[PDB]
């Protein structure tokens, strides 16, 4: 069981860090979340005014 767990986790981590479609995927996700937060906060400050 220990073998199972450790090997699985290590595989996942390193293989993700190494492939690539993932790099573009992450940049996209981060930017999207950031701009969503930005618009939400703009709306919030407008409501505050």
């Amino acid at each position: 069981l220990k073998h199972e767990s450790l090997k699985d986790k290590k595989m996942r981590q390193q293989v993700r860090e190494n492939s690539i479609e993932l790099r573009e995927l992450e940049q996209k996700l981060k930017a999207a979340y950031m701009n969503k937060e930005r618009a939400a906060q703009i709306v919030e400050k407008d409501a505050m005014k």
């Binding site: 981060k30 930017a31 950031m34 701009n35 937060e37 930005r38 618009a39 906060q41 703009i42 400050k45 505050m48």
Partner: protein, 427 residues
Amino acid sequence: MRECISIHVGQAGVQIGNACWELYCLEHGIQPDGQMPSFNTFFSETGAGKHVPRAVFVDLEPTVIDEVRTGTYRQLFHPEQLITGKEDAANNYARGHYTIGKEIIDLVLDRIRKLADQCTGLQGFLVFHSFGGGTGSGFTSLLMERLSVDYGKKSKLEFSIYPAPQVSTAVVEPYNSILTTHTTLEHSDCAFMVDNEAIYDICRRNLDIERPTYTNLNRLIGQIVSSITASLRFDGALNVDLTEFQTNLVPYPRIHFPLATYAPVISAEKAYHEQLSVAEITNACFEPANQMVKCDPRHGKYMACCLLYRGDVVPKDVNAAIATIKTKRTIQFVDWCPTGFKVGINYQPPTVVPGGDLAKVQRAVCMLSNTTAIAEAWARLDHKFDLMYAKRAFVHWYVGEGMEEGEFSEAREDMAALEKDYEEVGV
């Protein structure tokens, strides 16, 4: 274990520290009354599940501490830490140095002792203050001198509001500013400074904000301090320890007064349309507008420049934009510094305060300049003192409260030596 102990002295100190500690408490997941529903750089931990800051607050007018002691952060601090005097320093260097602070310097140093025995890997102190007032000059001078001769060669960083050219509230402000610069010329490792008039102009221009209060300035100073000390809490591509500034920036032991700014100060309604890449922000650091201390940049040449990048940043963008800045030959770097810069990078992006006005930006730079331009500010700050001290205005209170007439003179000469020292290291 990169622990630092923060002491806020002066009303400028505690009112900056309010914004600083709300920023640090929202930085981690700590809810503001103390609990939690990496943080050991600034917070000790008790087994009920409580977090205690490494902070000591002090003033000699009880109301500015007592509003903190009653307000929404009453359960953050061990309530003996909020030190409080009885009689105000009354804008008097002699009273905050010789007469009134002799009741409270012992208490604040003993609580500094207890916090430094709580700590285990100690690195430095953060003393927050101004150059305007009696307890912002004299009590800070006694505090720094005693901590220097007591603790050793540990980094007592100080943060200074600076007296602007045409912006002041006091009348006697050259007197106590030249006095605190004289007696704190030696035992502070570095002294960062900011100008309230320049922050006023940036608040008018970049942020599209008219009539700013003091909270809209202290938020910016909190972002500056957090960008200084993100390296100890969060790990990155090129970390920079807090001791590294001492061997990095200052070349001679009277020149430890670097300037700062922070480039993506931008509101949401414009940053929604504008992208801010690495080359954009590091070119934007070097405008005469977007600096944060009023000195004419083009009249001075640069000595060193420590950039701190925060967020998503790839190091080749930095290493290309630095040479792009260097080759212009109008940004005059001194001919005995071919290295030029010093750069650090951290991964975790700048954060956002509730009730805020700076837009959430993915990456940000805080740059620490060391210019030759501030000789004009020292010339004018010697000149105003010289205008008043031609016929002994306002001196008789301070001489009735504890210095003779000659000590203002020897502080005048021991400050003019520094203005000669810039022309020495300039030519």
